[PDB]
Design a binder for this molecule. Structure first.
Ligand SMILES: C[S@](=N)(=O)CC[C@H](N)C(=O)O
Ligand SMILES: C[S@](=N)(=O)CC[C@H](N)C(=O)O
Lengths: 170, 170
């Protein structure tokens, strides 16, 4: 697969992947599916902030997965920190697309001069925790029963990657 | 001091405390002061969500401190979790107002049917972390350099309290 910036034509594929995660996994703690308009607004909001939306695609242009990041917490002081998301279409798992997407995202974040990338992962998702660990992320939090989905409590694991360790001051 | 729900007449007092924290402390990671309208909007927004705003007041009716809570993360799955804030006027420290406000806030949260209360504390605030530890809060996050203020990086500590540990499922 090849990694590139998402275009409007990729939204339908992104939408399908997102809604599949919503209905079948704990990767996203939302149970209500969204529509195209919702993802179009999201697409525009990201462009407005200069934040990237990447997609793993093939020669045909099918969306095999996507990744992006946005603000983490609503306070001026967290401006050097973003929370990202990586979604691989179910049938494309086990092919390293997650690694390709996250590596590309890390490079864009660093190029944008950001300082820290935060990952919010459901604690039982060993596959995701491992992917992040091998890309430099370190566990920074374990928060039990802070979430819920499918009628059960869920635990959240926080991980983070410092994009510029030598930058001792903002 | 007595603890009661805030009213519109308490906003100027709350505004002063908030803005003083903005300019002189690392309790809130914002460096821009707000105006009364901002607080009035916040006041009405909390009421709409059924979230309380409590004030510690004296015989003269002065706001010696205030506390409240709101959503922690923007996803449906976190609806059982709230993030709180507690501010004591700077001349009223050492008078147990923080404990008084937090204990009252905890009871309100439990009564509203919430599952977890989260505190977001600058890691160097030993006093605040100790106060929360004594109220049953446990450390669940330690994130280096995710914030900044006064031209330096700041570390964030997350602490949490399960309000109803016997509730097996949401
Ligand atoms: C919904 S969740 N388990 O907190 C994951 C959120 C995802 N990283 C996002 O930024 O949309
Ligand atoms: C700005 S901060 N250090 O993340 C504290 C935020 C505070 N708990 C609040 O809810 O507004």
């Amino acid at each position: 697969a090849s990694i590139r910036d998402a275009g409007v034509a990729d939204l339908p594929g992104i939408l399908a992947i997102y809604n599949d995660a919503v209905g079948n996994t704990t990767a996203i703690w939302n149970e209500t599916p969204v529509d195209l308009a919702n993802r179009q607004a999201w697409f525009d909001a990201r462009a407005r902030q200069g934040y990237p939306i990447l997609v793993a695609s093939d020669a045909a242009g099918e969306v095999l997965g996507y990744a992006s990041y946005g603000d983490w917490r609503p306070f001026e002081g967290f401006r050097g920190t973003v929370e990202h998301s990586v979604y691989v279409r179910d049938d494309q798992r086990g092919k390293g697309l997650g690694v390709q997407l996250l590596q590309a995202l890390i490079e864009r974040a660093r190029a944008q001069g950001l300082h820290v990338m935060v990952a919010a992962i459901e604690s039982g998702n060993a596959a995701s925790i491992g992917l992040h660990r091998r890309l430099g992320f370190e566990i920074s939090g374990q928060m039990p029963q802070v979430g819920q989905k499918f009628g059960r409590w869920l635990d959240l694991t926080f991980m983070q990657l410092n994009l510029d360790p030598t930058r001792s001051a903002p």
